[PDB]
Amino acid sequence: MAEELVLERCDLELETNGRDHHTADLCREKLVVRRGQPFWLTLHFEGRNYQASVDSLTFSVVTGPAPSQEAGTKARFPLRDAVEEGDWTATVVDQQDCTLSLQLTTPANAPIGLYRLSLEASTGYQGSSFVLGHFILLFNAWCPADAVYLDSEEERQEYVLTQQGFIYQGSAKFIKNIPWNFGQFQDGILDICLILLDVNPKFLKNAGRDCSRRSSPVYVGRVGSGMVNCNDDQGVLLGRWDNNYGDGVSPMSWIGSVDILRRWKNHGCQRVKYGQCWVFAAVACTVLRCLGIPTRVVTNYNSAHDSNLLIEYFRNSEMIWNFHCWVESWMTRPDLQPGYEGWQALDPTPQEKSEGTYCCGPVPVRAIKEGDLSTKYDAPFVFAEVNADVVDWIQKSINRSLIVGLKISTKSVGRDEREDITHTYKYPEGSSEEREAFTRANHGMAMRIRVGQSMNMGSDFDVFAHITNNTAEEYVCRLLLCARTVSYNGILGPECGTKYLLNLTLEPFSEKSVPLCILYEKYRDCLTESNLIKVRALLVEPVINSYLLAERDLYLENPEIKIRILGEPKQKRKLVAEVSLQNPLPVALEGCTFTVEGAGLTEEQKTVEIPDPVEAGEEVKVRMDLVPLHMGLHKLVVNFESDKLKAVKGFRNVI
Amino acid sequence: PXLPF
């Protein structure tokens, strides 16, 4: 007898829902709500209203292209009074002549995204099923049961709802606060953000699983950040640091994330040119804030102090920059060991390189501080941005030419002020906690410059970076080994040999002597009458960001003047002195002249002239007459001068 | 812009 209900219309209650879900800017036309929290829909029936004793109403929701109940992307649930906490439910909260106001709740771990809501109404022996509408479901920092819950309203306002903020740039000494329009609730931005998820490589690999995993703010943070500068062509931005941004738009121009996002969408999800670290970070903040994950942009500063090999290596994309920016997002970490909930570092700057679909993060900030580098995801990459260990061997010594991890900064909550969060990444220098973390992060290595034989002006010779690994672990390092001439007063001249090794493998409990050949032809023209060559080595281990420097000055010695004493040493009479020198160069010597003197042996300075040039390796001798007189020691003294080999000295004691 | 430290 009872006939089926006829829905006239469903009122999405955008106004009360927007307000209560903190989604009002997003609900001007469509319904956007947050998980784990009741929202309202008001049904209007044509004719007869719902009667619980006759009518059975059942709701169905699906999200994604392959919804399933086991995946959590499909749910079916009846309209009824009993409300099971933590489930998809619908209950009556008001009933008037023609209207039925319902309260629907979603699980606090439901997948986020666009859902289609359908209703089946059944009266007795008949049923009818149809589409009520759609809603977008987001993460809920207000819901205690949600992984992204933040216990503080002022922080929820800052990190989810506030659409403008500050990105710090400049330097550690001169911090710049650049205002930024994140614009997460601007028209079209949420749709663009859902698009970004639906073109991510994990969605292409398995869209049903991808949409299911969108329950997790770990998963969505990883994908969201990871997609901003994505090795695949569908990422949001392309990086560039060569001051040459004419293809497109300069990183320094942008004052917001919105225009970039809209550009990206409009050009077939093709990367927008160009980003730099803070532009990637800024767009990541927009995306993640849109989806409901509390997020904040952070800047770390690094500082040099200036001939250093270390600063050369870098000067002339895991560099160490004047500043670097990433984001932090707030969430629990049930996928990790207990106690890692809270801020998680996400770094959307280009190179996904070691392993995995994305880099870098999320990694708990506490894991970084604690040097617990086995914690997923990509902990070494974030550790390396705020730590660098640099040691000199001039011969063991700490080198502060490079200080990384200074004045780590983010906008203060509810204020236009800078909050220093360095303490969150780094224990104080020299503290037991710092040293204990440094121990956990690297679980014996040494370097010095060796030669192994005499070094002679005119010769080609090898120098060696002698690297010792006295630990149980393998190391893969980059090595820079080079030589430059140097003056007695410490002025570095031109290069006379260089060797770069991208891939030096150091086996456990082993050593290597890595040679570099120093050629006469390379140091000859550019070398001081000091005869000095500075050899410098830099061993880099980019994973932990550790640096070993070795430096040694070498003296290229002059040829010896042989001085021979013909005749007797008796305290009296005639005596002849034979002095010689072998040309050590591979080239002939022009304008050779010996000058000789020595009171007690001679009374005239004897200067010999050698017109016949001394060929390479040829020795030249000259004999000259002495005449002693008294008991004891006399020192004959010799100068040899040339066009290519000046002021070489010698002496001999006689009697 | 971003420059080496």
Q: How far apart are CA A33 and CA A138, in angstroms?
A: 6
Topology alike, domains A1-141 and A142-307+317-387+401-443: no
Annotation marks residue A230 as catalytic: no
Q: How far apart are CA A397 and CA A366, in angstroms?
A: 29
State in words which class domain A560-655 has. mainly beta
Nearest by Cα to A405 from A390, A432, A423:
A423
Nearest by Cα to A17 from A47, A38, A1, A3:
A38
Q: How far apart are CA A295 and CA A193, in angstroms?
A: 15
* Angle between the N-to-C axes of helices A189-198 and A258-266, in degrees from 0 to 180, rounded to the nearest 10: 50
Give the count of beta carbons closer than 10 Å to the beta carbon of residue A255: 12
Q: Which 3 state secondary structure label does DSSP give A85?
A: coil
Q: Would you state the structure tokens that stand for residue A303, as one six-digit string?
A: 């500082």
Q: Would you state the structure tokens that stand for residue A343, as one six-digit string?
A: 């801020």
Contact A277 B4 (CB under 8 A): no
Measured between CA atoms, how close is B1 to chain A, in angstroms?
A: 7
Within 8 A of A323 by CB-CB distance, chain B residues are 2
Give the H or E element holding residue A379: helix A379-386
Q: How far apart are CA A653 and CA A637, in angstroms?
A: 9
**CA separation (Å) from A127 to A1, A57, A292?**
14, 9, 38
Beta bridge partners of A466: A448, A513
Nearest Cβ partner of B2 from A276, A304, A404? Answer: A276
As to burial, measured by CB atoms within 10 angstroms (0-12 exposed, 13-18 middle, 19+ buried), residue A645 is buried
Residue among A55, A146, A210, A347 flagged as catalytic:
A347
Q: How far apart are CA A649 and CA A557, in angstroms?
A: 12
Contact A574, A628 (CB under 8 A): no
Give the count of beta carbons closer than 10 Å to the beta carbon of residue A583: 22
Torsion sign, CA atoms A8, A9, A10, A15: negative
Q: How far apart are CA A405 and CA A320, in angstroms?
A: 10
Q: Would you state the structure tokens that stand for residue A34, as one six-digit string?
A: 């947050």
Nearest by Cα to A310 from A549, A634, A31, A593:
A549
Give the H or E element holding residue A424: helix A422-425
DSSP A24: G
Q: Which amino acid is at A348?
A: P
Tell me the technique behind this structure.
Answer: X-ray
**Rg of the Cα trace of chain B?**
5
Look at strands A592-597 and A575-582 and give their pairing. Answer: unpaired
DSSP string covering A464-495: EEEEEE-SSS-EEEEEEEEEEEE-TT--EEEE
* Angle between the N-to-C axes of helices A277-291 and A258-266, in degrees from 0 to 180, rounded to the nearest 10: 90
> Considering only alpha carbons, which residue of chain A is nearest residue B4?
A321
Q: Would you state the structure tokens that stand for residue A135, as one six-digit string?
A: 């809603």
Contact B4 A314 (CB under 8 A): yes
Q: Would you state the structure tokens that stand for residue A109, as one six-digit string?
A: 């771990």
Look at strands A475-486 and A492-506 and give their pairing. Answer: antiparallel
* Sole residue written with tokens 């977008």: A136
**CA separation (Å) from A152 to A107, A157, A160, A165, A387?**
22, 9, 12, 19, 31
Nearest by Cα to A624 from A569, A572, A563:
A563
Expressed in angstroms, the distance from the first to the final Cα of chain B is 12
Contact A303 B2 (CB under 8 A): no
Q: Would you state the structure tokens that stand for residue A393, as one six-digit string?
A: 């061997």
Half-sphere exposure of A14 (CA within 13 A, CB side): 12
Q: Which 3 state secondary structure label does DSSP give A68?
A: coil
Nearest by Cα to A580 from A614, A621, A550:
A621
Beta bridge partners of A650: A638
Q: How far apart are CA A405 and CA A302, in angstroms?
A: 6
**CA separation (Å) from A283 to A126, A191, A535?**
52, 15, 45
Contact A385, B5 (CB under 8 A): no
Contact A575, A568 (CB under 8 A): yes
Q: How far apart are CA A651 and CA A598, in angstroms?
A: 9
**Which phi and psi (to 5°) does residue A344 adopt?**
-125, 125
Look at strands A363-364 and A272-275 and give their pairing. Answer: unpaired
Measured between CA atoms, how close is A279 to chain B, in angstroms?
A: 11
Q: How far apart are CA A641 and CA A626, in angstroms?
A: 22
Within 8 A of A404 by CB-CB distance, chain B residues are 5
DSSP A188: T
Q: Would you state the structure tokens that stand for residue A486, as one six-digit string?
A: 């140097």
Q: Which amino acid is at A509?
A: F
Q: Would you state the structure tokens that stand for residue A579, as one six-digit string?
A: 């002095």
Q: Where are the beta strands (DSSP E) in A347-491?
A: 363-364, 389-393, 397-398, 402-411, 418-420, 445-450, 461-469, 475-486
Contact A7, A43 (CB under 8 A): yes
* Sole residue written with tokens 């002022």: A154
Beta bridge partners of A90: A79, A104
As to burial, measured by CB atoms within 10 angstroms (0-12 exposed, 13-18 middle, 19+ buried), residue A357 is middle
Could you check whether the bond before residue A362 is cis, i.e. omega within 30 degrees of 0? yes
Contact A620, A593 (CB under 8 A): no
Measured between CA atoms, how close is A402 to chain B, in angstroms?
A: 8
Q: Mention every residue, 6+ apart, whose C-beta is less than 8 A from residue A546.
A: A388, A389, A390, A442, A540
Could you check whether the bond before residue A488 is cis, i.e. omega within 30 degrees of 0? no
Best CATH choice for the domain A308-316+388-394+396-400+444-559 from the list 3.30.1330.10, 2.60.40.10, 3.40.50.300, 3.40.50.1000: 2.60.40.10
CATH code for the domain defined by A1-141: 2.60.40.10
Contact B1 A315 (CB under 8 A): no
**CA separation (Å) from A487 to A490, A496, A537?**
5, 14, 19
Q: Show me where the domains of chain A are located.
A: 1-141, 142-307+317-387+401-443, 308-316+388-394+396-400+444-559, 560-655
A and B: number of Cβ contacts within 8 A: 34
Q: Would you state the structure tokens that stand for residue A614, as one six-digit string?
A: 């001394």
Measured between CA atoms, how close is B4 to chain A, in angstroms?
A: 4
Give the count of beta carbons closer than 10 Å to the beta carbon of residue A322: 17
Give the H or E element holding residue A283: helix A277-291
Let me know the angle formed at the C-alpha of A577 by A572 and A581, rounded to the nearest 5 degrees. Answer: 160
Q: How far apart are CA A457 and CA A80, in angstroms?
A: 98
Beta bridge partners of A162: none
C-alpha A122, offset from chain centre: 60
Q: Which 3 state secondary structure label does DSSP give A235?
A: coil
Contact A320, B4 (CB under 8 A): yes
Residue among A193, A230, A277, A285 flagged as catalytic:
A277
Could you check whether the bond before residue A274 is cis, i.e. omega within 30 degrees of 0? yes
> Considering only alpha carbons, which residue of chain B is nearest residue A405?
B5
Q: How far apart are CA A433 and CA A444, in angstroms?
A: 21
C-alpha A477, offset from chain centre: 17
Contact A644, A598 (CB under 8 A): no
DSSP A158: I
Encode burial over A523-534: b for 16+ CB neighbours within 10 A, e otherwise: beeebeeebbbb
Give the count of beta carbons closer than 10 Å to the beta carbon of residue A312: 13
Whats the size of chain A, residue-wise?
A: 655
Contact A633, A627 (CB under 8 A): no
Nearest by Cα to A283 from A297, A269, A301:
A297
**Rg of the Cα trace of chain A?**
39
In the sheet with A445-450, reading across from the earlier edge strand, the strands are A445-450, A461-469, A510-518
DSSP string covering A102-153: EEEE--TTPPPEEEEEEEEEEETTEEEEEEEEEEEEE--TT-TTSTT--S-H
Q: Which 3 state secondary structure label does DSSP give A44?
A: strand
**CA separation (Å) from A608 to A55, A240, A577, A589?**
128, 67, 13, 15
A192 is in an annotated binding site: no
Q: How far apart are CA A208 and CA A199, in angstroms?
A: 13
Within 8 A of B2 by CB-CB distance, chain A residues are 241, 251, 276-278, 321-324
Q: How far apart are CA A347 and CA A229, in angstroms?
A: 10
- Third-level CATH fold of A142-307+317-387+401-443: Coagulation Factor XIII; Chain A, domain 2 (3.90.260)
A553 is in an annotated binding site: yes
Look at strands A32-34 and A126-138 and give their pairing. Answer: parallel
Q: How far apart are CA A331 and CA A294, in angstroms?
A: 8
Q: How far apart are CA A228 and CA A509, in angstroms?
A: 42
Torsion sign, CA atoms A216, A222, A227, A233: negative
Annotation marks residue A482 as catalytic: no
